[PDB]
Design an enzyme around this catalytic site. Structure first.
Site, short mmCIF file in Angstrom:
data_model
loop_
_atom_site.label_atom_id
_atom_site.label_comp_id
_atom_site.label_asym_id
_atom_site.label_seq_id
_atom_site.Cartn_x
_atom_site.Cartn_y
_atom_site.Cartn_z
N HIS A 97 1.05 -0.88 -0.19
CA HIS A 97 -0.46 0.17 0.21
C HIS A 97 0.87 1.42 -0.30
O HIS A 97 0.21 2.06 0.28
CB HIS A 97 -0.99 0.37 1.24
CG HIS A 97 -1.44 -0.66 1.11
ND1 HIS A 97 -2.75 -1.16 0.40
CD2 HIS A 97 -2.07 -2.08 1.87
CE1 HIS A 97 -3.82 -2.42 0.80
NE2 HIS A 97 -3.28 -2.62 1.66
N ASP B 22 -2.18 -11.09 -2.14
CA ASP B 22 -2.84 -10.70 -0.85
C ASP B 22 -4.37 -10.15 -0.93
O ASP B 22 -4.71 -9.71 -2.64
CB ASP B 22 -2.11 -8.83 -0.82
CG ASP B 22 -2.56 -8.37 0.54
OD1 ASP B 22 -3.83 -7.61 1.02
OD2 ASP B 22 -2.26 -8.68 2.10
N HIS C 58 -6.08 -7.38 -1.10
CA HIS C 58 -6.29 -6.11 -0.92
C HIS C 58 -5.30 -5.18 -2.27
O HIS C 58 -4.28 -6.21 -2.12
CB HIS C 58 -6.01 -5.00 0.38
CG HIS C 58 -6.29 -5.22 1.36
ND1 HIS C 58 -6.11 -5.89 2.85
CD2 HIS C 58 -7.33 -4.54 2.54
CE1 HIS C 58 -6.93 -6.17 3.60
NE2 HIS C 58 -7.97 -5.57 3.51
N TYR D 248 -3.54 -12.34 8.77
CA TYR D 248 -4.08 -11.94 10.24
C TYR D 248 -4.27 -13.50 11.12
O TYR D 248 -4.37 -12.31 12.24
CB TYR D 248 -5.29 -10.65 10.32
CG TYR D 248 -4.78 -9.36 9.34
CD1 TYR D 248 -3.63 -8.76 9.86
CD2 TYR D 248 -4.94 -8.99 8.46
CE1 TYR D 248 -2.37 -7.76 8.96
CE2 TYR D 248 -4.43 -8.40 7.36
CZ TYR D 248 -3.43 -7.62 8.10
OH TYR D 248 -2.07 -6.78 6.62
C1 LIG Z 1 -15.72 3.97 9.33
C2 LIG Z 1 -14.06 2.59 8.59
C3 LIG Z 1 -12.90 3.72 8.91
C4 LIG Z 1 -11.90 2.98 8.12
C5 LIG Z 1 -11.55 1.26 8.19
N1 LIG Z 1 -10.65 0.57 7.73
C6 LIG Z 1 -10.68 -0.19 6.91
O1 LIG Z 1 -11.25 -0.08 5.46
C7 LIG Z 1 -9.28 -0.65 6.27
N2 LIG Z 1 -8.96 -1.53 8.14
C8 LIG Z 1 -6.73 -0.51 7.65
C9 LIG Z 1 -6.18 -1.63 6.97
C10 LIG Z 1 -6.38 -3.35 7.32
C11 LIG Z 1 -6.24 -4.01 6.97
C12 LIG Z 1 -5.06 -3.78 5.89
C13 LIG Z 1 -3.84 -4.70 4.75
O2 LIG Z 1 -2.95 -4.18 4.64
N3 LIG Z 1 -4.03 -6.36 5.21
O3 LIG Z 1 -3.34 -7.38 4.29
C14 LIG Z 1 -4.67 -2.11 6.11
C15 LIG Z 1 -5.69 -1.38 6.47
C16 LIG Z 1 -8.97 -2.35 8.75
O4 LIG Z 1 -10.28 -1.96 8.60
C17 LIG Z 1 -9.19 -2.50 10.62
C18 LIG Z 1 -8.29 -1.51 11.00
C19 LIG Z 1 -8.03 -1.72 12.55
C20 LIG Z 1 -8.57 -2.77 12.39
N4 LIG Z 1 -8.19 -3.48 14.20
C21 LIG Z 1 -7.64 -2.50 15.28
C22 LIG Z 1 -8.60 -4.74 15.02
C23 LIG Z 1 -9.47 -4.21 11.98
C24 LIG Z 1 -10.05 -3.15 10.33
C25 LIG Z 1 -13.02 0.87 8.46
C26 LIG Z 1 -14.23 1.36 8.92
K LIG Z 2 -4.17 -8.25 -4.10
ZN LIG Z 3 -3.93 -6.89 2.53
#
Ligand SMILES: Cc1ccc(NC(=O)CN(Cc2ccc(C(=O)NO)cc2)C(=O)c2ccc(N(C)C)cc2)cc1
Ligand SMILES: [K+]
Ligand SMILES: [Zn+2]
Ligand SMILES: [K+]
Length: 356
Positions: free
Chosen positions: A132, A170, A172, A303
């Protein structure tokens, strides 16, 4: 010979405000431990980690971005929190810059070992991830784009036009890798990713199938976006059969880099998909048929500690030459996966005679 790089110093980067964050230090230690348990580590040539240099980071990143991430290592926690909050989905600790340097340098040493014939292929158990990260900014747990930098490092120790394939499995989209190489016909970028009409992280229509590259790079950016289905082994195998392998064979890469996140794995709490460890083994074994076997598997996301440990270990087993495990090859595809595959075929048939 298969190379393996792992260094416990990369565990030092962590989220100072959440001990249960998905991008956990134990991701890499659990993968490494599983290689020992499955008796794979002793079969590999151990490649040492090293630090990337700032000149090497400048192969893909701006001087301003390098200097800002470097500056974080002097900051008190309050200032680290402020800096991280300026990016999309980033946490920073005083060890983050050093860990990012070790992740990239580990991959450079792995690419060098492959290209000089010391090993045939290799795995790199590294964090933080890379795909990313953009030329000028950090994003999505990533500071520097390890895979992109490795492709440019490879060219720097061979010739500028060395043909490098980056396959990004990945879950994403690797927005940074796409952008870095968008105008480049020497680096073919192929990404498979959950898309959901742009709703899924990183939330951009840049990940859609009609983004085929720019200028001389037209045809050298292949986005395979999934919508609607809980995709797994049959869908990834079908994408490899109809798209990834025919395009890759026509490109004839001289080095294959895998942006190998394991967040599309069965069990992943974020990806929502169900690729199995045997599925990842089959994808690896297919890629081994390219580039005279010169394949480097680079950890990105993933994860579920059990899922990533079993999945990446199966990939190393394939690099070592073990027989691919049995798979039920007949299984019918989810209907939306066929729609996605056909959309990619329509977009890329003009550029690849193997799709006509
Ligand atoms: C309202 C709202 C705001 C933001 C989001 N964020 C997302 O959409 C993506 N992210 C962050 C993220 C997850 C994976 C990767 C990655 O590199 N993967 O390889 C890269 C980035 C998450 O969702 C996320 C973040 C923190 C978490 N904790 C602390 C349990 C769980 C999920 C969603 C809604
Ligand atoms: K990918
Ligand atoms: Zn990812
Ligand atoms: K490209």
């Amino acid at each position: 010979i298969t190379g393996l790089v792992y260094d416990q110093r990369m565990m030092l980067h962590h989220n100072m405000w959440d001990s249960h964050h998905p991008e956990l230090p134990q991701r890499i230690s659990r993968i490494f431990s599983r290689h020992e348990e499955l008796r794979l580590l002793s079969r590999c040539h151990r490649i040492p980690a090293r630090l990337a240099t700032e000149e090497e980071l400048a192969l893909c990143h701006s001087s301003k971005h390098i200097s800002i991430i470097k500056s974080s290592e002097h900051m008190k926690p309050r200032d680290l929190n402020r800096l991280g909050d300026e990016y999309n989905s980033i946490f920073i600790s005083n060890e983050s810059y050093t860990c990012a340097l070790l992740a990239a340098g580990s991959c450079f040493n792995s690419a060098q070992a492959i290209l000089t014939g010391q090993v045939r292929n290799a795995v790199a158990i590294v964090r933080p991830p890379g795909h990313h990260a953009e030329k000028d900014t950090a994003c999505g747990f990533c500071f520097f784009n390890t895979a992109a930098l490795t492709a440019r490092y490879a060219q720097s120790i061979t010739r500028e036009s060395l043909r490098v394939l980056i396959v990004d499995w990945d879950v994403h989209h690797g927005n940074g890798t796409q952008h870095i190489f968008e105008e480049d016909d020497s680096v073919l970028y192929i990404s498979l990713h959950r898309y959901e009409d742009g709703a899924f992280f990183p939330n951009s229509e840049d990940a859609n199938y009609d983004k085929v590259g720019l200028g001389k790079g037209r045809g050298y950016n292949v986005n395979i976006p999934w919508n609607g289905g809980k995709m797994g082994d049959p869908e990834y195998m079908a994408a490899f059969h109809h798209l990834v392998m025919p395009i890759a064979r026509e490109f004839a890469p001289e080095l294959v880099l895998v942006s190998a996140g394991f967040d599309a794995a069965r069990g992943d709490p974020l990806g929502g998909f169900q690729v199995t460890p045997e599925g990842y083994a089959h994808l690896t074994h297919q890629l081994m048929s390219l580039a005279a076997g010169r394949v480097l598997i680079i950890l990105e996301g993933g994860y579920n500690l059990t899922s990533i440990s079993e999945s990446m270990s199966m990939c190393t087993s394939m690099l070592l030459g073990d027989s691919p495990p049995s798979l039920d090859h007949l299984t019918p595809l989810k209907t939306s996966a066929t729609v996605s595959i056909n959309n990619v075929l329509r977009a890329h048939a003009p550029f690849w005679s193997s799709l006509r």
